[PDB]
């Protein structure tokens, strides 16, 4: 180990990988086989598929971080593994946005949902989400290159390549739109629940909405802020160096949301807890 | 239960003709449908099959890609579109209804058929020993047929069907899966076999049993026998 | 490695599975409502309003929402041997008139029909199959109750009651007495309504309460509520 | 009032019954059968799972050929299942979706149905038109229909929750014979193999033996402490087992007119939905409310095995005529075949 | 009054008819059940597990 | 600088040689990394110097960025 940020990143990634694999695996197992298919279940299955892909691809990032930028693999592997990382992370963010939209749609239009919202529509929307996730990470393939510095190799970016455009579009599609949609939808749910004709004096929906939005913002916000800042900073000063070193900590923090998603989303349902507990009991 | 079809007559060679069949008195959407061809001198020859959900459409080797079969379940009608007819298709066409499930009786009901006249391997074959036998009323007669492959599948069912075609009347199913009798068939007909040699026995034969007996297989895709004619 | 007939049979099974999925989706989009009224009650009226020998069922659509109507008034048997059949219902409508406090059943002179209705409501609310199932309370015959209050006191049915013989206070006390029998105050909600001669208002209340119950059920399934 | 007298005479006759049963009890089945070898542990894996239903399954019955079976659930449909190739032979939409009983004919032609609607509808499976149609409606009963069991092709015995059991005629449609002995809602009905006598278990904690042709009650059995939910004849036809809500399976003899032994365990507190016998009769299989099936030994009063496949309450359990397998259904919409 | 007396009379007549039936000893019935279980022990596929080849539910 | 010297040699004759000294001096390291633009104030050498400086600068960075760039970015 050579630096404090690298140590922090490794601690966060190791804890993330270790917590993430059993929780995501158990949720995917219980939802896929131990429960009947519903509309919510399709969302949890796709979200856990994305989270499992992120967790399984965590050792590649951890090893690349431990080696301090050393890349012994080919150019294709360095144009394919980052694309997979970007695709699965943004697919997870999009699925979260769609879950927030589905909940808002159910509360806002219950009559329409009870007649025109089924498993097929959920599967179709999820497939479209995956297509959007793919299309969004196209530049990561098209513009990643292998930089060979005499003695060693390292994978990175370079009419020059537009990186500022990729980061800004990444920020607008993956951060500004999901955060605004999630805050607006959960806020609407809380507002409608507390102001009606049969409103109940309770605070569970507000607590769950605040926790979900806060965890999403705390995780994804540093990654986007640092990414924009580094591009708007000359990488010679000490400031550029510190931003580059702390960016790895931001990558680990982004992975943390993928680890946290099953506990946040699937395990807050009583039926899911019942099923999961029963399945765990059977094994033991 | 009635099957009335039309679309026959004189067809010039190379032309196109649509055979239309109307089914009444039964559920048509749940039945697989078949088209069977019979020459004026030869036996029954299978032409096509469409299932209940308009999938698994199967054709004979001689008509593959030349005939298209389709159906309409709300209108209860089966259509066969025939293109580029040669002089080998100048034969009667029969519409057969078959339902497939455990204990079912497929090929139970046959249509009247339409005359169509054109102006001038690697399949299971059936071997027939003799084509015409003299029979007297009140006697017992056994007719034997042979198959090139053993029809006893691993699930314990031997797939053999017996059809009776009286002169001037549609074929009628007598025995299905070589043991079971069909609905409306009297109890004196019986069948036996081991997988290759198959025997149908008639005890106390009546004058209404005079006709042509056809043996068919249904293990893989369907071939008829040449036919055994019974004379007084 | 299977026969031609075996294949065809599998295809038939697939078609049946389809039909089953389509029919299950058609059944899932409908909202189910059971009805329970002890003895004489507004059941005969409420059913008529909804429309505009065993179990009777009527189908009706109000504001593009299909309602399943279940009535069990012809079942003169032990309820516990079949009440478990109604676990998956969305709503249970308990119909109770207010004009039954002075009136008594024709089996025992001492007991009142209001206490019997309270007993039945207590049994339904404390039933183990109805923990998650919402109950909509309907109060029937307001005008004849007002006439009886003007003619007779309310103390004949509640000795512990102490208040004026006013319709608003008496109705509030009856509503509070019925809603105090809900031992499970968190998982169950009671939608008390005062039924009127207008058919549209009762159906509208049913639609609104059912809409709220659907929203709450979906949120509970998601884990948010 | 001479009604009190009548009461006293009935009490004296009941005292005579219990005195005769006590006098006739020279031994018990446990001390007679303790000398034979134990059955040992029995483990049955899930050979097949039938998963077509979408709601809770209530009743099930086996065919004579032991391959075709009938399943009823709250989706409003009867499903004819093929056991060997897990196929669906027929799907019958019900007029009333509140079904609590289904039966398969011994000939194989008809399927009986019934439930909260007061009708044991008869469905014809061998129609010329190819679909399954209602043969007729049987509307005599007032209470909920508990169990239909085809006595024959033209005669069907049935039980309902109006405290009576009736024998119907398929062709005429009239209530050929009505049995009115019970004082509680009848829940379980079982038929003897010789097709002459049948047992009915009700909620008055008593099982009654009835005669088909004559029409009167032969014997009564008052061992249970709670509502008898299940009843099943021993293959010999001289005994029957009952399962009630007091977590106790009791075996009653027709000739001895007494309860030989009780099958209970301390951990078990839940009620018994369904009880069946094996072809030999050595094994008594009983469903339970706690998501479980117990294969009790019918002679040693010991638990031969446990079957813990289902995720919800086991409501129906049947054993084939050749004893090859046992099908169990439950409220999670799954049928499992065990052997 | 009349309905209750009728029901009581029918109950007494029924119970008396049930009491009039003949009985056999418990030991003999137990021995008969044990003999039936022992006789058909080899013909039970659930009591004794059958081989996979002879089992129709083999797969 | 490094392989950049290689790239320095892959710029001397990637563009026609106006003044080898001017471009080479422009591509020198930067103790006075203060900048490019500025360094032209105390020297057609100016324009060539600015272009060479811009190309070399942009390029040391594209390494610097590459050196610590994570996979997820
Ligand atoms: C790193 C490894 C050990 C993480 C393991 C995570 C899994 C196995 C743990 C973490 C959260 C746990 C669940 C948390 C809450 C409940 C609700 C409780 O009423 C039953 C147990 C149950 C359902 C737990 C089952 C086991 C569980 C799902
Ligand atoms: C899926 C993830 C875990 C794969 C990680 C692969 C890592 C562990 C492998 C792949 C390439 C390997 C390196 C390849 C070459 C060398 C040079 C040798 O003289 C020392 C070992 C060393 C430095 C290897 C260390 C281990 C290594 C970095
Ligand atoms: C990228 C994100 C912002 C796209 C969000 C699209 C949302 C706002 C749109 C797309 C589909 C739309 C729904 C389509 C159909 C109906 C039925 C109508 O009777 C009520 C409105 C309602 C329910 C719409 C509400 C708004 C809606 C949910
Ligand atoms: C390593 C990365 C690239 C793996 C990505 C796997 C993606 C592309 C695959 C794996 C699972 C697949 C989904 C599986 C199921 C369905 C339901 C179907 O009705 C629509 C397609 C859809 C939604 C698929 C879309 C594509 C999908 C999401
Ligand atoms: C469809 C809408 C709602 C969401 C997506 C908006 C996208 C398509 C828009 C909004 C902001 C825009 C960016 C604004 C600024 C820049 C910097 C410029 O040097 C390159 C183009 C670029 C990067 C624009 C590209 C297109 C862009 C990213
Ligand atoms: C940045 C925003 C993230 C949003 C996530 C992707 C949302 C895609 C929605 C696609 C809607 C398609 C609706 C089709 C409905 C139908 O097929 O009938
Ligand atoms: C670019 C962003 C577009 C909008 C994306 C967010 C959509 C959120 C929809 C919330 C619906 C709230 C409607 C409230 C109506 C009311 O006043 O009752």
Q: Is A180 helix (H, G, I), strand (E, B) or coil?
A: helix
Contact between residue D256 and residue D232 where contact means Cβ atoms under 8 Å apart: no
Contact between residue B52 and residue D152 where contact means Cβ atoms under 8 Å apart: no
Contact between residue D208 and residue D200 where contact means Cβ atoms under 8 Å apart: yes
- What is the distance of C-alpha B125 from the center of its chain? 15
Q: Is A162 helix (H, G, I), strand (E, B) or coil?
A: coil
Structural domain including D303 reads 2-338
Instruction: Record the tokens describing residue A48, joined without a space.
Output: 């856990």
Rounded (10°) angle between helices C199-222 and A77-108: 150
Instruction: Record the tokens describing residue D125, joined without a space.
Output: 């499976």
Residue B92: φ, ψ to 5°? -70, 140
DSSP state of C49: H
Report how far residue A210's alpha carbon sits from residue F60's, in angstroms, rounded to the nearest whole number.
45
Contact between residue D10 and residue E8 where contact means Cβ atoms under 8 Å apart: yes
Contact between residue A175 and residue A167 where contact means Cβ atoms under 8 Å apart: no
Report how far residue D202's alpha carbon sits from residue D226's, in angstroms, rounded to the nearest whole number.
10
Contact between residue C7 and residue B159 where contact means Cβ atoms under 8 Å apart: no
Q: Is B191 helix (H, G, I), strand (E, B) or coil?
A: strand
Contact between residue D307 and residue D316 where contact means Cβ atoms under 8 Å apart: no
Instruction: Record the tokens describing residue D146, joined without a space.
Output: 């508990």
Tell me which ligand sits closest to the C-alpha of residue A37: 4
Report how far residue A83's alpha carbon sits from residue A256's, in angstroms, rounded to the nearest whole number.
19
By the 10 Å C-beta count (0-12 exposed, 13-18 middle, 19+ buried), D19 is classed as: exposed
Q: Is C37 helix (H, G, I), strand (E, B) or coil?
A: coil
* Residues in chain E, total: 59
Contact between residue D242 and residue D252 where contact means Cβ atoms under 8 Å apart: yes
Q: If phi over 0 gives left and psi between -120 and 50 gives alpha, with beta otherwise, what is residue B7?
A: left
Say whether D87 and B27 touch across the interface (CB within 8 A): no
Rounded (10°) angle between helices A39-66 and A77-108: 150
Residues lining ligand 5, CB < 6 A?
A 164-165, 168-169, 172-173
Backbone interruptions in chain E following residues (C to N > 2.5 Å): none
Report how far residue D160's alpha carbon sits from residue D138's, in angstroms, rounded to the nearest whole number.
12
Residue listed under structure tokens 């749910």: A189
Report how far residue D327's alpha carbon sits from residue D317's, in angstroms, rounded to the nearest whole number.
6
By the 10 Å C-beta count (0-12 exposed, 13-18 middle, 19+ buried), B208 is classed as: exposed
Ligand 7 contact via A188 beta carbon (within 6 Å): yes
Residue C123: φ, ψ to 5°? -65, -40
Report how far residue D225's alpha carbon sits from residue E57's, in angstroms, rounded to the nearest whole number.
40
For residue D274, give the nearest of D61, D79, D66 by alpha carbon: D61
Structural domain including F13 reads 1-73
Vertex B157 angle, CA B152 and B159, to 5°? 70
Q: Is A42 helix (H, G, I), strand (E, B) or coil?
A: helix
Rounded (10°) angle between helices A119-136 and A77-108: 140
Report how far residue B207's alpha carbon sits from residue B227's, in angstroms, rounded to the nearest whole number.
19
Residue C194: φ, ψ to 5°? -110, 110
How far apart, in Å, do the first and last CA atoms of chain D sit?
A: 61
Contact between residue D97 and residue D76 where contact means Cβ atoms under 8 Å apart: yes
From chain D, the residues in CB contact with E31 under 8 A are: 32
Tell me which ligand sits closest to the C-alpha of residue A132: 6
Residue listed under structure tokens 């439930």: D115
Contact between residue D141 and residue D160 where contact means Cβ atoms under 8 Å apart: yes
How many Cα atoms within 13 Å fall on the side-chain side of residue C185?
A: 5
> Which of residues B118, B153, B180 is at a domain's end?
B118
Beta-carbon contacts of B9 under 8 Å, excluding residues fewer than 6 positions away, are B115, B116, B117
For residue A154, give the nearest of F3, F42, D83 by alpha carbon: F3
Classify the C-alpha dihedral A61-A65-A67-A69 as positive or negative: positive
Task: Work out the minimum CA distance from C196 to partner chain A, whole angstroms.
Answer: 19
| Interchain CB contact of A270 with C (< 8 Å) | yes
Instruction: Record the tokens describing residue C46, joined without a space.
Output: 């409420």
* Residues in chain A, total: 284
Beta-carbon contacts of C200 under 8 Å, excluding residues fewer than 6 positions away, are none
Instruction: Record the tokens describing residue A158, joined without a space.
Output: 């370079």
| Interchain CB contact of D42 with E (< 8 Å) | yes
- Pair (B104, B130) in one structural domain: no
Instruction: Record the tokens describing residue D150, joined without a space.
Output: 């085809």
From chain D, the residues in CB contact with C53 under 8 A are: 118
Instruction: Record the tokens describing residue B178, joined without a space.
Output: 């070589």
Domains of chain B: total: 2
Residue D109: φ, ψ to 5°? -85, -35
Report how far residue E26's alpha carbon sits from residue D259's, in angstroms, rounded to the nearest whole number.
10
Say whether D100 and C6 touch across the interface (CB within 8 A): no
* CATH code of the domain covering residue D198: 2.130.10.10
Vertex B102 angle, CA B96 and B104, to 5°? 30
DSSP state of B171: E
| CA quadruple D104, D109, D115, D117: dihedral, nearest 10 | -170
DSSP state of B182: P
Domains of chain D: total: 1
| Kind plus residue range of the DSSP H or E element containing A110 | helix A110-116
Report how far residue B100's alpha carbon sits from residue B51's, in angstroms, rounded to the nearest whole number.
10
Say whether B53 and C15 touch across the interface (CB within 8 A): yes
Residue listed under structure tokens 């479209």: A128
Residue B116: φ, ψ to 5°? -125, 120
Classify the C-alpha dihedral C38-C40-C42-C45 as positive or negative: positive
Report how far residue D207's alpha carbon sits from residue D231's, in angstroms, rounded to the nearest whole number.
8
User: What is the chain A residue with the closest CA to F55?
Assistant: A160
Rg (alpha carbons) of chain E, rounded to whole number: 24
Report how far residue A188's alpha carbon sits from residue A204's, in angstroms, rounded to the nearest whole number.
15
Task: Residue F5: count other Cβ atoms within 10 Å of its Cβ.
Answer: 11
Ligand 4 contact via A31 beta carbon (within 6 Å): no
Q: What is the 3-state secondary structure (H, E, C) of chain D?
A: CCHHHHHHHHHHHHHHHHHHHHHHCCCCHHHHHCCCCCCCCCCCCEEEEECCCCCCEEEEEECCCCCEEEEEECCCEEEEEECCCCCEEEEEECCCCCEEEEEECCCCCEEEEEECCCCCEEEECCCCCCCCEEEECCCCCCCCEEEEEECCCCEEEEEECCCCEEEEECCCCCCCEEECCCCCCEEEEEECCCCCEEEEEECCCCEEEEECCCCCEEEEECCCCCCEEEEEECCCCCEEEEEECCCCEEEEECCCCCEEEEECCCCCCCCCCCEEECCCCCEEEEECCCCCEEEEECCCCCEEEEECCCCCCEEEEEECCCCCCEEEEECCCCEEEEC
Beta-carbon contacts of A245 under 8 Å, excluding residues fewer than 6 positions away, are A3, A5, A6, F68
* Residues in chain D, total: 339
The DSSP annotation for chain E comes to -HHHHHHHHHHHHHHHHHHTS----HHHHHHHHHHHHHHTSTT-TTTTTPPSTT-TT--
Classify the C-alpha dihedral C93-C98-C104-C106 as positive or negative: negative
Report how far residue B18's alpha carbon sits from residue B72's, in angstroms, rounded to the nearest whole number.
14
Residue listed under structure tokens 């009671």: C190
Q: Are D and E neighbours with ≥3 CB pairs closer than 8 A? A: yes
Indicate the pairing of strand B228-231 with strand B132-134. parallel
By the 10 Å C-beta count (0-12 exposed, 13-18 middle, 19+ buried), A232 is classed as: exposed
- Mutation to probe ligand 5, out of A172, A175, A224, A232 (largest number of atoms < 8 A from CB): A172
Domains of chain A: total: 1
| Kind plus residue range of the DSSP H or E element containing A104 | helix A77-108
Say whether A157 and F33 touch across the interface (CB within 8 A): no
Classify the C-alpha dihedral A257-A259-A260-A266 as positive or negative: positive
Ordered by where they begin, the domains of chain E are: 1-54 (4.10.260.10)
From chain D, the residues in CB contact with B101 under 8 A are: 87, 89-90
Report how far residue D228's alpha carbon sits from residue D185's, in angstroms, rounded to the nearest whole number.
10
Report how far residue D106's alpha carbon sits from residue D84's, in angstroms, rounded to the nearest whole number.
19
- Pair (B114, B130) in one structural domain: no
> Which of residues B118, B140, B171 is at a domain's end?
B118
Q: If phi over 0 gives left and psi between -120 and 50 gives alpha, with beta otherwise, what is residue B138?
A: left
Q: Is A137 helix (H, G, I), strand (E, B) or coil?
A: coil
Instruction: Record the tokens describing residue D314, joined without a space.
Output: 């086991």
| Kind plus residue range of the DSSP H or E element containing B160 | strand B160-165
Ligand 4 atom with least separation from CA of A120: 19
Contact between residue B107 and residue B205 where contact means Cβ atoms under 8 Å apart: no
Q: What is the 3-state secondary structure (H, E, C) of C127-194?
A: CHHHCCCEEEEEEECHHHHHHHHHHCCHHHCCCCCCCCCCHHHHHHHHHHHHHCCCCCCCCCCEEEEE
Structural domain including A160 reads 1-284
Ordered by where they begin, the domains of chain C are: 31-208 (3.40.50.300)
Residues lining ligand 3, CB < 6 A?
A 101, 105, 109, 112, 181
Report how far residue A268's alpha carbon sits from residue A264's, in angstroms, rounded to the nearest whole number.
7
The structure was resolved to a resolution in Å of: 2.9
F9-29 b/e with 16+ CB inside 10 Å = b? eebeeeeeeeeeebbeebbee
Tell me which ligand sits closest to the C-alpha of residue A62: 2
From chain C, the residues in CB contact with D118 under 8 A are: 53-54
Report how far residue D39's alpha carbon sits from residue F58's, in angstroms, rounded to the nearest whole number.
86
> Which of residues B90, B118, B146 is at a domain's end?
B118
Contact between residue C21 and residue A37 where contact means Cβ atoms under 8 Å apart: no
Instruction: Record the tokens describing residue B211, joined without a space.
Output: 């006709």
| Interchain CB contact of D20 with E (< 8 Å) | yes
User: What are D327's strand-pairing partners?
Assistant: D318, D337
Beta-carbon contacts of C57 under 8 Å, excluding residues fewer than 6 positions away, are C68, C69, C70, C71, D96
- Cα diameter, chain A: 73
Tell me which ligand sits closest to the C-alpha of residue A174: 6
* Residues in chain C, total: 225
Q: What is the 3-state secondary structure (H, E, C) of B6-60?
A: ECCEEECCCCEEEEEEEEECCCCCCCEEEEEEECCCCCEEEEEEECCCCCCCEEC
How far apart, in Å, do the first and last CA atoms of chain E sit?
A: 66
Contact between residue F50 and residue F31 where contact means Cβ atoms under 8 Å apart: no
Per DSSP (E only), the strands in chain A are 145-149, 152-156
Question: DSSP H helical segments within C52-112, as ranges?
Answer: none
By the 10 Å C-beta count (0-12 exposed, 13-18 middle, 19+ buried), A22 is classed as: exposed
B96-133 b/e with 16+ CB inside 10 Å = b? bbbbbbbebbbbbbbbebbebbbeeeeebebebeeeee
DSSP state of A175: I
User: What are B190's strand-pairing partners?
Assistant: B201
Contact between residue C96 and residue C38 where contact means Cβ atoms under 8 Å apart: yes
Q: Is A14 helix (H, G, I), strand (E, B) or coil?
A: helix
User: What residue's CA is closest to ligand 7, atom 18?
Assistant: A108
Q: Is B130 helix (H, G, I), strand (E, B) or coil?
A: coil
Helix/strand/coil percent split, chain F, to 5: 60, 0, 40
Structural domain including B110 reads 2-118
Give CA separation, C210 vs C48, C61, C70, C215, F70, in Å: 19, 13, 15, 9, 53
Q: Is B96 helix (H, G, I), strand (E, B) or coil?
A: strand
* Residues in chain B, total: 232
The DSSP annotation for B199-225 comes to EEEESS--GGG-SEEEEEE-S----B-
User: What are D284's strand-pairing partners?
Assistant: D277, D296
Report how far residue B68's alpha carbon sits from residue B65's, in angstroms, rounded to the nearest whole number.
7
Question: In the complex, which subunits touch A with 3 or more CB pairs below 8 angstroms?
Answer: C, F
From chain F, the residues in CB contact with A61 under 8 A are: 70-72
Task: Residue B187: count other Cβ atoms within 10 Å of its Cβ.
Answer: 7
How many Cα atoms within 13 Å fall on the side-chain side of residue C168?
A: 0
For an interface test with A, which of C215, C216, C220 has the most A Cβ atoms less than 10 Å from its Cβ? C215
* CATH code of the domain covering residue B80: 2.60.40.10
Say whether D129 and B183 touch across the interface (CB within 8 A): no
Beta-carbon contacts of D230 under 8 Å, excluding residues fewer than 6 positions away, are D187, D188, D201, D242, D243, D244, D272, D273, D274, D275, D286, D287
For an interface test with C, which of A114, A120, A262, A272 has the most C Cβ atoms less than 10 Å from its Cβ? A114
Report how far residue D134's alpha carbon sits from residue D139's, in angstroms, rounded to the nearest whole number.
14
Report how far residue E41's alpha carbon sits from residue D299's, in angstroms, rounded to the nearest whole number.
13
User: What are B158's strand-pairing partners?
Assistant: B152
Q: Is B175 helix (H, G, I), strand (E, B) or coil?
A: strand
């Amino acid at each position: 180990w050579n630096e404090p940020p690298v140590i922090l990143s490794m601690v966060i990634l190791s804890l993330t990988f270790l917590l993430g694999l059993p929780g995501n695996g158990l949720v995917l197992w219980v939802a896929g086989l131990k429960m009947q298919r519903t509309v919510n279940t399709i969302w949890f299955l796709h979200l856990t598929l994305a989270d499992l892909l992120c967790c399984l691809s965590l050792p590649f990032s951890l090893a690349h971080l431990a080696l301090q930028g050393q890349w012994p693999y080919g150019r294709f592997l360095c144009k394919l593994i980052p694309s997979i990382i970007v695709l699965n992370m943004f697919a997870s963010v999009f699925l979260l946005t769609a879950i927030s939209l589905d909940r808002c749609l159910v509360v806002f239009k219950p009559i329409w949902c009870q007649n025109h919202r089924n498993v097929g529509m959920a599967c179709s929307i999820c497939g479209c989400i995956w297509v959007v996730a793919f299309v969004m990470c196209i530049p990561v393939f098209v513009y990643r290159e292998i930089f060979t510095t005499d003695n060693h190799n390292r994978c990175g970016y370079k009419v020059p390549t537009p990186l500022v455009a990729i980061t800004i579009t990444r920020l607008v599609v993956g951060f500004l739109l999901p955060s605004v949609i999630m805050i607006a939808c959960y806020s609407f749910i809380v507002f409608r629940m507390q102001r009606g004709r049969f409103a109940k004096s309770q605070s569970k929906t507000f607590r769950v909405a605040v926790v979900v939005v806060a965890v999403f913002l705390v995780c994804w916000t540093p990654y986007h802020i640092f990414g924009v800042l580094s591009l708007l900073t000359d990488p010679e000063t000490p400031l550029g160096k510190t931003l580059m070193s702390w960016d790895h900590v931001c990558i680990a923090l982004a992975s943390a949301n993928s680890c946290f998603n099953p506990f946040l989303y699937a395990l807050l349902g009583k039926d899911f807890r019942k099923k999961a507990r029963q399945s765990i009991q059977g094994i033991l | 239960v009635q099957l009335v079809e039309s679309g026959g007559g004189l067809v010039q060679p190379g032309g196109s003709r649509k055979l239309s069949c109307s089914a009444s008195g039964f559920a048509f959407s749940s039945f697989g449908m078949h088209w069977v061809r019979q020459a004026p001198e030869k036996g029954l020859e299978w032409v096509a099959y469409i299932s209940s959900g308009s999938g698994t459409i199967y054709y004979a080797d001689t008509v593959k890609g030349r005939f298209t079969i389709s159906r309409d379940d709300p209108k209860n009608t089966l259509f066969l579109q025939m293109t580029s007819l040669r002089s080998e298709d100048t034969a009667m066409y029969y519409c057969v209804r078959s339902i497939y499930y455990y204990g079912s009786s497929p090929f139970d009901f046959w249509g009247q058929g339409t005359t169509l006249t054109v102006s001038a391997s690697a399949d299971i074959v059936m071997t027939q020993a003799t084509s015409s036998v003299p029979v007297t009323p009140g006697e017992s007669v056994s007719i034997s047929c042979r198959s090139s492959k053993s029809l006893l599948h691993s699930n314990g069912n031997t797939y053999l069907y017996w059809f009776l075609q009286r002169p001037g009347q549609s074929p009628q199913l007598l025995i299905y899966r070589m043991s079971n009798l069909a609905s409306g068939v009297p109890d004196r007909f019986s069948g036996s076999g081991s997988g290759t040699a198959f025997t149908l026995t008639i005890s106390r034969l009546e004058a209404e049993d005079v006709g042509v007996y056809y043996c068919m297989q249904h293990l893989e895709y369907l071939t008829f026998g040449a036919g055994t004619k019974l004379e007084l | 490695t299977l026969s031609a007939e075996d294949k065809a049979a599998v295809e038939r099974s697939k078609m049946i599975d389809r039909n089953l999925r389509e029919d299950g989706e058609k059944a899932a989009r409908e909202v189910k409502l059971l009805l329970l009224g002890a003895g004489e009650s507004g059941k005969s009226t409420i059913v008529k309003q909804m429309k505009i020998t065993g179990i009777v069922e009527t189908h009706f659509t109000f504001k593009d929402l299909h309602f399943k109507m279940f009535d069990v008034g012809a079942q003169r048997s032990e309820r516990k041997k079949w009440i478990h059949c109604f676990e998956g219902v969305t709503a249970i409508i308990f119909c109770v008139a207010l004009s039954d406090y002075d009136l008594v059943l024709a089996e025992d002179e001492e007991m009142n029909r209001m206490h019997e209705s309270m007993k039945l409501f207590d049994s339904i609310c404390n039933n183990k199959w109805f923990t998650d199932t919402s109950i909509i309370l309907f109060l029937n015959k307001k005008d004849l109750f007002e006439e009886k209050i003007k003619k007779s006191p309310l103390t004949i049915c509640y000795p512990e009651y102490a208040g004026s013989n006013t319709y608003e206070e008496a109705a509030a006390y009856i509503q509070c007495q019925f809603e105090d029998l809900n031992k499970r105050k968190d998982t169950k909600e009671i939608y008390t309504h005062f039924t009127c001669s207008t058919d549209t208002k009762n159906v509208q209340f049913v639609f609104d309460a059912v809409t709220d119950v659907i929203i709450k059920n979906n949120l509970k399934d998601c884990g948010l509520f | 009032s001479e009604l009190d007298q009548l009461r006293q005479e009935a009490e004296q006759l009941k005292n005579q019954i219990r005195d005769a049963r006590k006098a006739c009890a020279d031994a018990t089945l446990s001390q007679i059968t303790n000398n034979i070898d134990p059955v040992g542990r029995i483990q049955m894996r899930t050979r097949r799972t039938l998963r077509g239903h979408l709601a809770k399954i209530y009743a099930m019955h086996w065919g004579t050929d032991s391959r075709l079976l009938v399943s009823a659930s709250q989706d409003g449909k009867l499903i004819i299942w093929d056991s060997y190739t897990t196929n669906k032979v027929h799907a019958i939409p019900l007029r009333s979706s509140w079904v609590m009983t289904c039966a398969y004919a011994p000939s194989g032609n008809y399927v009986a149905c019934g439930g909260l609607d007061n009708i044991c509808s008869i469905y014809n499976l061998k129609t010329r038109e190819g679909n399954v149609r209602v043969s007729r409606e049987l509307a005599g009963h007032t209470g909920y229909l508990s169990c239909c069991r085809f006595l024959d092709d033209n005669q069907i015995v049935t039980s309902s929750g109006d405290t009576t059991c009736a024998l119907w005629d398929i062709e005429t449609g009239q209530q050929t014979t009505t049995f009115t002995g019970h004082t509680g809602d009848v829940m379980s009905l079982s038929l003897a193999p010789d097709t002459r006598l049948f047992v009915s278990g009700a909620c008055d904690a008593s099982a009654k033996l009835w005669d088909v042709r004559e029409g009167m009650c032969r014997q009564t059995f008052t061992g249970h402490e709670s509502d008898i939910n299940a009843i099943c004849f021993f293959p010999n036809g001289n005994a029957f087992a009952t399962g009630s809500d007091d977590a106790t399976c009791r075996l009653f003899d027709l000739r001895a007119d007494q309860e030989l032994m009780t099958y209970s365990h301390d951990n078990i507190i839940c009620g018994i939905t369904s009880v069946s016998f094996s072809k030999s009769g050595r094994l008594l299989l009983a469903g339970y409310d706690d998501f479980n099936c117990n294969v009790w030994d019918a002679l040693k009063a010991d638990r031969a095995g446990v079957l813990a496949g289902h995720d919800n309450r086991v409501s129906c359990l049947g054993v084939t005529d050749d004893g090859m397998a046992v099908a169990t259904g439950s409220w999670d919409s799954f049928l499992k075949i065990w052997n | 009054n009349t309905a209750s007396i009728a029901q009581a009379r029918k109950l007494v007549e029924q119970l008396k008819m049930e009491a009039n039936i003949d009985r056999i000893k418990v030991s003999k019935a137990a021995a008969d059940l044990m003999a039936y279980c022992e006789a058909h022990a080899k013909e039970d596929p659930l009591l004794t597990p059958v081989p996979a080849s002879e089992n129709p539910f083999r797969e | 600088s490094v392989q950049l010297t290689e790239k320095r040699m892959d710029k001397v004759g990637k563009y026609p040689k106006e003044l080898r000294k001017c471009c080479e001096d422009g591509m020198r390291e930067n103790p006075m990394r203060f900048s490019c633009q500025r360094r032209t104030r105390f020297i057609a050498c100016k324009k060539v110097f600015l272009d060479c400086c811009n190309y070399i600068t942009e390029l040391r960075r594209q390494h610097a960025r590459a050196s610590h760039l994570g996979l997820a970015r």
